[PDB]
Design a protein around this ligand. Structure first.
Ligand SMILES: O=C(c1c(Oc2ccccc2)n(-c2ccccc2)c2ccccc12)N1CCNCC1
Ligand SMILES: *[C@@H]1O[C@H](CO)[C@@H](O)[C@H](O)[C@H]1NC(C)=O
Length: 337
C-alpha cells in the first residue's frame, strides 16, 4: 500500500481519548475509543431500551436509516474490566479517517449506567487481534489491512498531556505509520509474548531506586482503552504503601502537598527503563494539605488468559508515543512531544 491515515482525538480530562467514525449510508457519526485491549467494534443501538439511561444520552445506530446495512442478528455479550455490554451483530460500511471498510460490529441493546453514563464516547473500536474477538468477528484493522492501501501494517497512538485549552489537539491515531511531529528520538521495540494480544514481558517495577515489584518478571498489556496504569490488587496495594497513598472506593489518593514529593515509578521493558515522575502520575489539582489528589494508577484484576497483567493505559502513553506493529508482532515506544 501507499497511504497513511489519521484520526484526530479529543482529550477529555486526561481520562478519555476518542475520535469520530461514520457508520452506514448516509454516515451516522459516533464518538469512539480506539482500544488495543479488545478486538470488537460496537456502538449503542436504536433497539436499546430507553430504560438504560446510557442509551438516552448516547448516539444510537439506526439500521433503518442505512441503505448499506446487512442484517446478522447473532447475539453477543462483551465483558470488560469496567462493565458489560450486550446486543447483536450487524454489518455496514464504517469510515475511519478517510478509509472506508465493510465491518461486522455490535449493536448494543443493553448498556449499564455504570460505567457508560460516565463515558463521553458512544462506542468502542477494538484494535486488538482476532484471537481476542468475541464471536470471532474480523477486527477493523484486519479488514483495513486486507484492502492493501496502508503503507505499513502498523498503527500509532499519540495522547496529549493537555486536555484543557483548544488548538492543542487531544491526540492522534495514525493508521499505516507514525507521526514524527509527535515523538523524539528513536523507537525502542519490545516483541509480543505471543500473537493475539498486545502484551509484552515486564522485567520489574521500581519505586524510586529499588525494585519493589515484578522481580522475576510479569506481564504488561499496552492498552489504549484504559485511562490509567493498572496492576493486580496485591501489586497496587504494595505500590501504594510505598507511596504513602490512601485507598478509596475507586482510586488511591495522596494529600496534594505530598504530590511533588512522591518518587519516580519505573517500568522495565525490553532492557530499557520507562520512568514516570510524580507529575506524570498525580492529578496535581492543588498544593493544599487540606485537599486530596488522585493518582493515575489503580488496581484492576484482569482475568485469565490475558491476566493477571499490568495494563499500560493513557497515563503511560501520554509520556511514551506508541507504535503497534502487526507485521513484526512488536510494540515500539518513543518519547512523546
Ligand atoms: O473497560 C475498560 C475501561 C473503560 O471502558 C471501556 C470499555 C470498553 C472498551 C474500552 C474502554 N474505561 C472507561 C473510562 C471512562 C469512562 C468509562 C469507562 C476505563 C477506565 C480505566 C480503566 C479501564 C477502563 N477497559 C477494558 C477494555 N479495554 C480497555 C480498558
Ligand atoms: C453472521 O455473520 C457470520 C459471518 O461473519 C455468518 O457466518 C453467520 O452465519 C451470520 N448469521 C446470520 C444469521 O446472518
Amino acid at each position: 500500500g501507499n497511504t497513511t491515515s489519521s484520526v484526530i482525538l479529543t482529550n477529555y480530562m486526561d481520562t478519555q481519548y476518542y475520535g469520530e467514525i461514520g457508520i452506514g449510508t448516509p454516515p451516522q457519526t459516533f464518538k469512539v475509543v480506539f482500544d488495543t485491549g479488545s478486538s470488537n467494534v460496537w456502538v449503542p443501538s436504536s433497539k436499546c431500551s430507553r430504560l438504560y439511561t446510557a442509551c438516552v444520552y448516547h448516539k444510537l445506530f439506526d439500521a433503518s436509516d442505512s441503505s448499506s446495512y446487512k442484517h446478522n442478528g447473532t447475539e453477543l455479550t462483551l465483558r470488560y474490566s469496567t462493565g458489560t455490554v450486550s446486543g447483536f451483530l450487524s454489518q455496514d460500511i464504517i469510515t475511519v479517517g478517510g478509509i472506508t471498510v465493510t465491518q461486522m460490529f455490535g449493536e448494543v441493546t443493553e448498556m449499564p449506567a455504570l460505567p457508560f453514563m460516565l463515558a463521553e464516547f458512544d462506542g468502542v473500536v477494538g484494535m486488538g487481534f482476532i484471537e481476542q474477538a468475541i464471536g470471532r468477528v474480523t477486527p477493523i484493522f484486519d479488514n483495513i489491512i486486507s484492502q492493501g492501501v496502508l503503507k505499513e501494517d502498523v498503527f500509532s497512538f499519540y495522547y496529549n498531556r493537555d486536555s484543557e485549552n483548544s488548538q492543542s489537539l487531544g491526540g492522534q491515531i495514525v493508521l499505516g505509520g507514525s507521526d514524527p511531529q509527535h515523538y523524539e528520538g528513536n523507537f525502542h521495540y519490545i516483541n509480543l509474548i505471543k500473537t493475539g494480544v498486545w502484551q509484552i514481558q515486564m522485567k520489574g517495577v521500581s519505586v524510586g531506586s529499588s525494585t519493589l515489584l515484578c522481580e522475576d518478571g510479569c506481564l504488561a498489556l499496552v492498552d489504549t482503552g484504559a485511562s490509567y496504569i493498572s496492576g493486580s490488587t496485591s501489586s497496587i496495594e504494595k505500590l501504594m504503601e510505598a507511596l504513602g497513598a490512601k485507598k478509596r472506593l475507586f482510586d488511591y489518593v495522596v494529600k496534594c502537598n505530598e504530590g511533588p514529593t512522591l518518587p519516580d515509578i519505573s517500568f522495565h521493558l525490553g532492557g530499557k527503563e520507562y520512568t514516570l515522575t510524580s507529575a506524570d502520575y498525580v492529578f496535581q489539582e492543588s498544593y493544599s494539605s487540606k485537599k486530596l489528589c488522585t493518582l493515575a494508577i489503580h488496581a484492576m484484576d484482569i482475568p485469565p488468559p490475558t491476566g493477571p497483567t499490568w495494563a499500560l493505559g493513557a497515563t503511560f502513553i501520554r509520556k511514551f508515543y506508541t507504535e503497534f506493529d502487526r507485521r513484526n508482532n512488536r510494540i515500539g515506544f518513543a518519547l512523546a512531544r
